[PDB]
Design a protein around this ligand. Structure first.
Ligand SMILES: O=C(O)CNC(=O)C(=O)O
Ligand SMILES: [Mg+2]
Ligand code: NI
Ligand SMILES: [Zn+2]
Length: 331
């Protein structure tokens, strides 16, 4: 078995190997990359996502989210308070302000220490989940707006045509902006490109050990667990690496820098934080190997998780027994 310790693997494809996206995901899996739940892909030196980022300031962040924490430094939840709209140029200025800017630090490990010590005492503002793309239309390789759709994959594998669409999302971050522990909708893959700015630190649990994280989460968030049998679908719970290590949960960590892709694999729980002002683009995708994960994915039906239009078909076709209850939670 390849990669039996479930380490995060880093790949350096050549420009020739960068042509065929599906083929390269399958290659990475042949080497055991999925066992980690996360892989890094460094693009060939010839590649670029677009020519410059000099003209992005007028993008609108319609609903910036202030991420307010509750709990203790290593075990906390966050809620999202909606703020008034602002442009990316306005948000960048805010991120660089004395109130929100990255503190002085020695290296990524010192900054990680500072994040876990101090995150809860601040409420950073995240420009998350903005439909759109920063890839140039002429970028033909690993263009996250030109991927094969999940609806087409399900139709190719299973023979059933379904409604729905699959488009990318932009994320504008600042110091301490946080992504809570989660897997993707329907335990899909994700791919995330860090277009510009400061790094993003990731934590990930191997897919084979995801249920260990779920059991710890039920223990640490006992009210939430009584409320919902899949409450990590709410995307609000944080657990620090120190707490994971104290509880014997297998995990890994890595820092993504601008110009790098990350892929999350089906049922790979992940969480993390931004180091400072940045912009990422991400989208879900599927492969044939996903189908079995999609069939087994947990679902939130309590009403909290509320998701896209396109998840309806995935539940309806892959999980017909669960459909009626899940749809009630959507309505
Ligand atoms: O970058 C973020 O805030 C969160 N991204 C992801 O969870 C992802 O790409 O799957
Ligand atoms: Mg602009
Ligand atoms: Ni994710
Ligand atoms: Zn729920």
């Amino acid at each position: 078995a390849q990669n039996p310790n479930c380490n995060i693997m880093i790949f350096h494809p050549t420009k020739e190997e960068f042509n065929d996206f599906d083929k390269y995901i399958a290659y990475m899996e042949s080497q055991g990359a999925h066992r980690a739940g996360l892989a890094k892909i460094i693009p060939p030196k010839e590649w670029k996502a677009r020519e410059t980022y000099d003209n992005i300031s007028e993008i609108l962040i319609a609903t910036p989210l202030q991420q307010v924490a509750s709990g203790r430094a290593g075990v906390f939840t966050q809620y999202h308070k909606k703020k008034k709209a602002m442009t990316v140029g306005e948000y960048r200025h805010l991120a660089n302000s004395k109130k929100y800017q990255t503190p002085p630090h020695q290296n990524f490990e010192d900054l990680e220490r500072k994040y876990w010590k101090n995150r809860i005492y601040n409420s950073p503002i995240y420009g998350a989940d903005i439909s759109g793309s920063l890839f140039d239309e002429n970028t033909k390789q690993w263009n996250l707006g030109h991927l094969g759709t999940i609806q087409d994959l399900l139709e190719k594998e299973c023979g059933v045509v379904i409604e729905g669409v699959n488009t990318p999302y932009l994320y504008f971050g600042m110091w301490k902006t946080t992504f809570a522990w989660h897997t993707e909708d329907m335990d899909l893959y994700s791919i995330n490109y860090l277009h510009l700015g400061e790094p993003k630190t990731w934590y990930v649990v191997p897919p084979e050990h995801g249920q260990r994280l779920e059991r710890l989460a039920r223990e640490l968030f006992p009210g939430s667990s009584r409320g919902c049998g899949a409450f990590l679908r709410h995307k609000v719970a944080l657990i620090s690496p120190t707490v994971l290590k104290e509880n014997g949960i297998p995990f890994n960590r890595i820092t993504q820098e601008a110009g790098e892709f990350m892929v999350t694999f089906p049922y790979g729980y992940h969480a993390g934080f931004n180091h400072g002002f940045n912009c990422a683009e991400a989208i879900n995708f599927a492969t044939p190997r996903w189908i079995d994960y999609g069939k087994m994915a947990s679902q939130c039906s309590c009403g909290e998780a509320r998701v896209t239009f396109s998840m309806d078909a995935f539940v309806r076709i892959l999980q017909p027994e669960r459909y009626d209850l899940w749809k009630r939670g959507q309505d």
